[PDB]
Inverse folding.
């Protein structure tokens, strides 16, 4: 559900 | 921040294509973008264009006709190819890549590669006196030589106080030019034999030039 | 089309707070992020502010970015000024097509001696050069501080639009600055105007010298 | 695990990304 922005 | 391995030629001949590259070492070449910038030495920053991972390209209208931006994901590099070059394209070129220590990103630039554009072969200077008129200035114009540098001294080194030698200028021709000047008391004009001693080692040239009043 | 204009020079003494403005000519400045680049001599520009007001780690809290939609400008404030803050500063933003646009650049001087106006000596073409079919007016500028000038050349009190090359201010022995400007002509062009001027502007005041083919 | 940008991120405007 959650993805981290790089 | 990012070490970006910027690479390119020191010297390019007019109407050649100037080509530069930068590479990444973090495996990211398939993502993010590259911006290209250049700086004529002693002048401001000019942006050339951008290529990104949508695979859109953005160009400076002044250069779009002549600019090609490309990414080779195999070599992990971006390339900038600038065609139909003139001496006006002499500049330090920079690639800029986003650095992202987290969610936010800011651009990190390459070391910079100075590209000189010139058709010229090795040539020694033509030296011309800058004749004078309590005190007067006199000098020499050291004109149209390539490559750098020139040494310039006065009275074979006997004169040094009150001497200014200025940094060289690259001219439209692709040849450099430079000046040296001395400030002296007027009464010396008919008394001292003022001379420029100019040595352009690249061409094995030595020139001695007397600077008498007008 | 759109330009971001900056002051050519900003000066302040240690411990003082200095502001560098960046004003956008058309469209809303607040519509695109503004970045601030610092450039120390001979090194590539690095970010001191990005996304209007964000600081990289390693940049002091003394550096502050701000936006003012009423003046359509961005500003970089540096408080508690230190000698290490001495550099050139460029704002960077974008236009409606997302092309980068840089400001013209601001030289920031941390004042360590009193203001010194330039001394100007202008030389005409030499006889030996003219009969080699080249003409070069040589304008030498020296003993000025802070190390920022603009040079303009005039032909019969009209601005010269071509043939000019100028050097960056260079630190002379006494930590004042020197610069040189060159106006290249043909001998026929040299003798086609009654007089020529070299106009040297420093800290809002202009020093001028003129020559004539006589 | 990650959302990385494909183009320059913009003030007050959406832009394209990809999941990785």
């Amino acid at each position: 559900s959650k993805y981290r922005l790089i | 921040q990012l070490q970006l391995q910027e690479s390119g030629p020191g010297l390019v001949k007019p109407s050649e294509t100037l080509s530069l590259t930068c590479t990444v070492s973090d495996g990211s070449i398939r993502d993010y973008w590259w911006n290209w910038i250049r700086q004529p030495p002693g002048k401001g920053l000019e942006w050339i264009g951008r290529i990104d991972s949508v695979v859109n390209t953005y160009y400076n209208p002044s250069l779009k006709s002549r600019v090609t931006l490309s990414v080779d994901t195999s070599k992990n590099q971006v390339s900038l190819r600038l065609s139909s070059v003139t001496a006006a394209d002499t500049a330090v070129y920079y690639c800029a890549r986003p650095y992202c220590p987290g969610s936010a990103c800011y651009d990190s630039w390459g070391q910079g590669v100075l590209v000189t554009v010139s058709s010229a072969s090795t040539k020694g200077p033509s030296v011309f006196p800058l004749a004078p008129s309590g005190t007067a200035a006199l000098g020499c114009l050291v004109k149209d030589y390539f490559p750098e540098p020139v040494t310039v001294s006065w009275n074979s080194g006997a004169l040094t106080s009150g001497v200014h030698t200025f940094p060289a200028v690259l001219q439209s021709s692709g040849l450099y030019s430079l000046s040296s000047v001395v400030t002296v008391p007027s009464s010396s004009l008919g008394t001292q034999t003022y001379i420029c001693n100019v040595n352009h080692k690249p061409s094995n040239t030595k020139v001695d030039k007397r600077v008498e009043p007008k | 089309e759109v330009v971001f204009t900056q002051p050519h020079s900003v000066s302040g003494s240690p411990g003082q707070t200095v502001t560098i403005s960046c004003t956008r000519s058309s469209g809303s400045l607040d519509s695109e992020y503004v970045q601030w680049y610092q450039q120390r001599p001979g090194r590539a520009p690095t970010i001191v502010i990005y996304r209007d007001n964000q600081r990289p780690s390693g940049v002091p809290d003394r550096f502050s970015g701000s936006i003012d939609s009423s003046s359509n400008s961005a500003s970089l404030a540096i408080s508690g000024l230190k000698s290490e803050d001495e550099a050139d500063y460029y704002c960077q933003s974008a236009d409606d097509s997302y092309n980068w646009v840089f400001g013209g650049g601001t030289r920031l001087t941390v004042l360590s001696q009193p203001k010194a106006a330039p001394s100007v000596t202008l030389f005409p073409p030499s006889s030996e050069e003219l009969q080699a079919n080249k003409a070069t007016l040589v304008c030498l500028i020296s003993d000025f501080y802070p190390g920022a000038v603009t040079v303009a050349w005039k032909a019969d009190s009209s601005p010269v639009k071509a043939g000019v090359e100028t050097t960056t201010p260079s630190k002379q022995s006494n930590n004042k600055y020197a610069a040189s400007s060159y106006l290249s002509l043909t001998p026929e062009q040299w003798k086609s105007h009654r007089s020529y001027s070299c106009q040297v502007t420093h800290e809002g005041s202009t020093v001028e010298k003129t020559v004539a083919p006589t």
Summary: The CA atoms of residues 50 and 178 of chain B lie 37 Å apart. Residues 6-117 of chain B form a domain with the Immunoglobulin-like fold (CATH 2.60.40.10).
